[PDB]
Amino acid sequence: KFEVSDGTPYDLNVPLVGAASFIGWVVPTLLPSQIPLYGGKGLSTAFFASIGTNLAKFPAPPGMTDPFWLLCFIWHSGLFATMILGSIGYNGYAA
Amino acid sequence: MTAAYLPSILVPIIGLIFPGLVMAFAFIYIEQD
Amino acid sequence: SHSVKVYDTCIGCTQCVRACPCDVLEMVSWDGCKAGQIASAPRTEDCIGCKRCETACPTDFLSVRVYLGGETTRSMGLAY
Amino acid sequence: TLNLQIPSPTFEGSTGGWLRAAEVEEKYAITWTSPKEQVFEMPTGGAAIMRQGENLLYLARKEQCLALATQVKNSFKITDYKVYRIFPSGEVQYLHPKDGVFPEKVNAGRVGVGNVSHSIGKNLNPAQIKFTSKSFNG
Amino acid sequence: SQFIKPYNDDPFVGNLATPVSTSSFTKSLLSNLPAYRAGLSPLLRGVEIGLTHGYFLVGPFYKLGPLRNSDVALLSGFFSALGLIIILVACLTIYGVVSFEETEAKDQLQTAKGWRQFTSGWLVGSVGGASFAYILISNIPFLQTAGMSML
Amino acid sequence: DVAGLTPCGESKEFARRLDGSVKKLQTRLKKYEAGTPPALALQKQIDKTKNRFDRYGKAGLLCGTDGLPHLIADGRWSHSGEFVIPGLFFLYVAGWIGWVGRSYVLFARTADKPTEKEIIIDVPVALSFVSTGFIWPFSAFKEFTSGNLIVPADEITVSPR
Amino acid sequence: KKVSITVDRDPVATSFEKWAQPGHFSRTLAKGPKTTTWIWNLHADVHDFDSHTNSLEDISRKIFSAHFGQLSIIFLWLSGMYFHGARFSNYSAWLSNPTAVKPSAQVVWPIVGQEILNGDVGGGFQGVQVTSGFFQIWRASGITSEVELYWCALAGLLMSGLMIFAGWFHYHKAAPKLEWFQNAESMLNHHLSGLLGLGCLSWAGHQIHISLPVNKLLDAGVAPQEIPLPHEFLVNRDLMAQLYPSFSKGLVPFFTLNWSEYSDFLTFKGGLNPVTGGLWLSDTAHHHLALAVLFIVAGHMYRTNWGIGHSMKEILEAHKGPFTGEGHKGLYEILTTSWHAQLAINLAMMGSVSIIVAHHMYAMPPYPYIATDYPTQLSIFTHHMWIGGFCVVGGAAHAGIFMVRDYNPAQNYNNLLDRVIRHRDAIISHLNWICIFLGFHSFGLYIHNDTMRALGRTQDMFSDTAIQLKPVFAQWVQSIHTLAPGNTTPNALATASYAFGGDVVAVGNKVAMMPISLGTADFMVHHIHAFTIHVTVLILLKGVLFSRNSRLIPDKANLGFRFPCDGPGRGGTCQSSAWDSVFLGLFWMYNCISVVIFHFSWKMQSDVWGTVQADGTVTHITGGNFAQSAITINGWLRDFLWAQASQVIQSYGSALSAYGLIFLGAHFIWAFSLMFLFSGRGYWQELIESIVWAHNKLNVAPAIQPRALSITQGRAVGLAHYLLGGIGTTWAFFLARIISVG
Ligand code: CLA
Ligand code: CLA
Ligand code: CLA
Ligand code: CLA
Ligand code: CLA
Ligand code: CLA
């Protein structure tokens, strides 16, 4: 019974929108590229590999020239765009 | 300087305590009915 | 409040009453002019002091005069 | 007499409406009757639709009410509007038109307030009335 | 499906009901804050608010003050926070002196006795929170270096 | 001479100013080929500088210790051409302009629409007026003495005192 | 069909009668003057067409023909620049030696000693040095002789005559109807595909067929007189294929989509040409060709007589959500009925584009030998920055004019405009708070640094050798753009600009472009820029949103867009109109653009521009003082204002003395403006009463009664002389400094 306003009950559909937007953004971004930023992997997989690499170096943050920041920014930008569009499509149309 | 303690005693008082008490009491005076 | 005076040079053209945004002025019966009416200011507690009435007055130097005085919530035009 | 049960124009609301001083110091009300539902501009910003029949609306200032009255007079030919002042105690003071006749028309019983019996050039000098409770008008 | 409605179903009040202003999350957070939470004396509202604000006040004074590169940086930062707390308590006191008439009602914040209780609670909470932050930064090297001790 | 100043034709600092100006133009002249238009222009500038300094040195102008001509304007006849005679020339031209403008204003007052005469000038009548201005002192004085220049104080609007 | 040509023939007779009736366009003004105020009013409302008549058709016809007149004036101006380049310039000598000949296309007559302004500009030439960059444009276009410049001047003059004839024809002989003007879809299709698309395509044609071979021969060292004429490059395909062998293959690779064959004259090289310091012209040719294709594609989007196409009303009305009510409904009617709304949008867009032009043109120099021409770079950056700021504020002004005049609440119920008006208080309050926050945490850093450096506490300052404010995001973006060639743009040989990082491109021992590092001072000045822009937005947006009414004045729309006040009541209602908000926002725009161009001038002189000497070291103009001095106001006052004004104040007796004279005169006009800005009308009217008594005593009082300027005119005159004085002072200071040291 989440009210989005004073008297406006609205279903946020956070599980569906989150899961569907995550899958619909991650799966197309599994397309590989041979550029050094990706390293032979897709955008999502290069991002996850960079997460593992930098978590193997805790305290020490990723450097400026490290591909982690660019991978994180592009991946989260596309994810946020997918989440916004998925929220619009599922909450509005619902069919 | 003779009585060299007097600047370090009086300058914080004159510059922080005097204006604070003046501003507080003037505020009370100008806002009371 | 502001003080609004109407002098006997008034010709009763009712322009100052029509120009008043705050309903301060009104026309009352008089015999001093050809129109048979003079402006009056019974409600100067609502006067904001905009001097639109003086702008509307056509007599050489004005018949209606606004003297700004003590400021109140109404005269300052405060919606808060 | 202000009927508090008069319906209001359909308005979506705005941040320009009345503040805490309306419920604490004084508030103003304007009522009018329209022949049809039609869109007018709010004096606080925004468009509202007045209903067919009676309309009651609340404002913070008398000038806002009279601006709305002038707008509905000159754009919709509505002249039956009434402006009231309401206090927090519940007292309603009828304001406009004060005697039922608009102030630009002469009405019997009105007495002149603030009338001076000479021209403006006949006022007294400030040095004449200094240290003295005489008015500058004489 | 409209998300913005007139505030309190009143189209002529100077406010709008928005998701930032009137959602369930906003209403829960605002009603659960100590300044608005039901069942609290004004003194305890003051205690909670003072604990929070006085606790976080130590940090900027300790890390950025003129004595920040000295061995007495934390002591100076806590003393600066205490001086700010005393100044703000004087501000609260003079606000309550000029703002409220002496009434029997004392269970509300916006009463004279209620504001005095709130000021007392805010002073005691602010001193306690600043002292707690001082203790934690004095005894934990992680807080002294803001995490750089891990590197 | 006057006020301790020296005549410019014998002041050494006047000569130093002339020499410095000529040298400053000649070092610019050195970078251009003879017969090029910049060379001719620079040589003409050198000639104008030399002629100006010669004329100023032979005019009885007084130079101070700075090396520049100083004008005397106390009324003495040995320096009447430095302020007094240019002053008479200005006063003649300015009285001409004022007289013809006043005459046009008084003509425009007689027209059907005076303001149209102010914004759209009657050019033949204005040219007649600007021709009339050569005898402006005598005409203006006769206008004054006949009561046609000054209007009395009871016919001019004034504010309440 | 629905989109058709409808015209009225001979609507307005061509006559000189109304030329003799000033104020004929206005019923108020046509009665003639009675006071001098009329005169000012006659020049003040004259091109305000909607206030003279209510017919939208007549207004649209006047607008169309006035636009033709402006195009005629612009073409005459261009023809003048080409002619003065042809006859009064050293352009051929500059073509022979670009690195040592200062461009000059103005020669003065000798009258009163002003012949000193004909400075020794090189090439055996004396004249006024010009900084508009026309020499570099003509070199990029392949103009090698002054005969071609004469022909260009003739073409400009002929186009000026054609435009002025078209204005007379399309107003006085064949005026289009209102239905012709109200085709937004057809106008957008034709102007996207035909104006921008075919224009880009034809300029790509000129670049590929003319500019590339002539500039390739020029960069190889061929003298301009031995280069073949452009038509010889057109007809001799062997001569063209000697430079670009793909021209031996003809147009077959284009039509068969074998486009990589054209890779020798359509490149994606990036960086700069090492010989000239400009962009590769092959890159510009592919750029303009790709833009032509994209624009022609975009010009087929909108619906016209045939059934295909988008309807913009449908597009607008479909985009609406739960936060926004009716959404973008009603905007098509506004933008097809109100000329002021279109002028607001287009002025805002043109101003933003001019600002983008200034940034992108300093950073990626597009013309040969323009990067090392530091006066040209500084002049064009400053000029297009000023034009952009003025146009953006004009967009706000004409938005306010739409809001007062053309806005109809009946046609605007619960759409985006109505909801913006209905939460204007929230908008303006949050903007006010963010402006105060930006002012404190940007300018108080400078104040804090002034105090710390004055108190002898250097370790307490905000600096790179002190408590640091690193611009980490911009540095990260610079690292990305430096790493981009071969990684995120794999087919680009070099970076988009060397300002992000890379090598020092130097031409003739002068830095064309080098990396522009960002430190604490760059952080502080970019957040100063953000503060000034947000405050200008606050003033202009508050004026637009409160143009019709407010809590103070509930009937402000009845008073109009431009009124002085509503009297001394309500405490005082001075400067309450939207016009007065534009009046204040012009001052704040001046402040913003002044700080922007000062940042540019100091940063380029300190960290980019300079001379390259042995061992590859770069000696900058001010020797890298920006990092330690631009963190304090004292450093800006001493090391930028005091230090770099030495050239304009010691310019007397040289060719740059006109800049010293203009410097003094602009200080004078700026100070003169404060008489109008600080004073009020009643004082001047009473002083004029005394002067009227003096003229009345001599019977010389004018028939047109002299009045003091109106309150709005007092504000406008003060603002105009203020802007002229300040901009002229910066103009003279910049130009004298950069001509002397660069
Ligand atoms: C492909 C057709 C086409 C083209 C090229 C243009 C071009 C232009 N229109 Mg436009 N217009 C068109 C169709 C077109 N329109 C249609 C169909 C409509 C009706 C819906 C309009 C309605 C319209 C209005 C209402 C207005 C314009 C305006 C303008 C000018 C904008 C200012 C500018 O950048 O000028 C600089 C650009 C130039 C190219 C300068 C040269 C100008 C001439 C006329 C170009 C002619 C090129 C010619 C077709 C081919 C010869 C080139 C070569 C082969 C010899 C510009 C000249 C505005 C203007 O300023 O009007 C005067 C304006 O107010 N247009
Ligand atoms: C980024 C991914 C994405 C995109 C592009 C779309 C696009 C669309 N969805 Mg959709 N959807 C998504 C994710 C996405 N969806 C997810 C994750 C869910 C599950 C929660 C849904 C559930 C959903 C439902 C239930 C329905 C839609 C519908 C629609 C269509 C119309 C409504 C709309 O949002 O128009 C958006 C309009 C556009 C995208 C075109 C305009 C283009 C401009 C430039 C905006 C695009 C922004 C940018 C370029 C996008 C980049 C994506 C990024 C990942 C790189 C439209 C084709 C409705 C429909 O009719 O389709 C059947 C419908 O019924 N969607
Ligand atoms: C003449 C008035 C005056 C005086 C005496 C001082 C004195 C001082 N200022 Mg300064 N200051 C003043 C005016 C004054 N200021 C003004 C007008 C401004 C605004 C521009 C500032 C802004 C300013 C900043 C921004 C900072 C100082 C700091 C300091 C301290 C110097 C560094 C140090 O060793 O602190 C060591 C500090 C301590 C050991 C803490 C002392 C705590 C005191 C004793 C508590 C007093 C409580 C209160 C006043 C009780 C009375 C309340 C009543 C008036 C209502 C010193 C106490 C710095 C500082 O350290 O602040 C603490 C600092 O950061 N000042
Ligand atoms: C017909 C021309 C005319 C005449 C005869 C006068 C006469 C006078 N003016 Mg006046 N004035 C005029 C035009 C004229 N004014 C105009 C057009 C302006 C507006 C700029 C003023 C502004 C003005 C001020 C502000 C003051 C005077 C003052 C004075 C008095 C002293 C002389 C002076 O200061 O001159 C100086 C005059 C000026 C600086 C302005 C003159 C502008 C031009 C050059 C004159 C107009 C020429 C006109 C175009 C001729 C057309 C004729 C043609 C059609 C045939 C004197 C009564 C002063 C005063 O009160 O002294 C007691 C004073 O303070 N006037
Ligand atoms: C595409 C450009 C464009 C167009 C077509 C318009 C068109 C219009 N504007 Mg707009 N405006 C623009 C840009 C534009 N503006 C910009 C960029 C600004 C910001 C400065 C404004 C600010 C603005 C305001 C604030 C107002 C208008 C108004 C108007 C209307 C009447 C203008 C008039 O009669 O002036 C007639 C022309 C003049 C008075 C000439 C002005 C001369 C200037 C001030 C001095 C020029 C100095 C020169 C460049 C250098 C001199 C130096 C030398 C002396 C040494 C008209 C609809 C007015 C209106 O009522 O609209 C309804 C109004 O109040 N506009
Ligand atoms: C140098 C002159 C100057 C300064 C400092 C200001 C300052 C300001 N103007 Mg302003 N203005 C100016 C000239 C100036 N103006 C001129 C010439 C015009 C003519 C057109 C205007 C027109 C104008 C308009 C139209 C608007 C402003 C606005 C603002 C405010 C912006 C918010 C801000 O930066 O907060 C931060 C405050 C500052 C940067 C002021 C200096 C404070 C520094 C950081 C030190 C503080 C130290 C501390 C207080 C010391 C205490 C000591 C104790 C003893 C008191 C701010 C109050 C806008 C506004 O009010 O809305 C936000 C706005 O809308 N101004």
Ligand SMILES: CC1=CCCC(C)(C)[C@H]1/C=C/C(C)=C/C=C/C(C)=C/C=C/C=C(C)/C=C/C=C(C)/C=C/C1=C(C)CCCC1(C)C
């Ligand atoms: C991070 C987080 C994620 C993003 C979103 C976000 C929500 C905005 C953000 C939160 C930022 C902010 C909002 C984080 C929330 C922050 C606040 C500042 C935390 C305050 C804690 C106060 C306690 C510890 C002091 C407790 C008192 C102790 C026990 C005292 C004992 C004392 C008593 C009097 C008795 C005597 C003994 C002593 C010792 C003197």
Ligand code: SF4
């Ligand atoms: S000043 Fe304004 S409110 Fe007061 S009487 Fe005159 S018009 Fe009415």
Ligand code: SF4
């Ligand atoms: S406007 Fe002047 S003349 Fe007319 S009624 Fe009012 S006071 Fe009298």
Ligand code: SF4
């Ligand atoms: S000072 Fe001028 S602008 Fe201000 S209220 Fe008075 S007349 Fe109007």
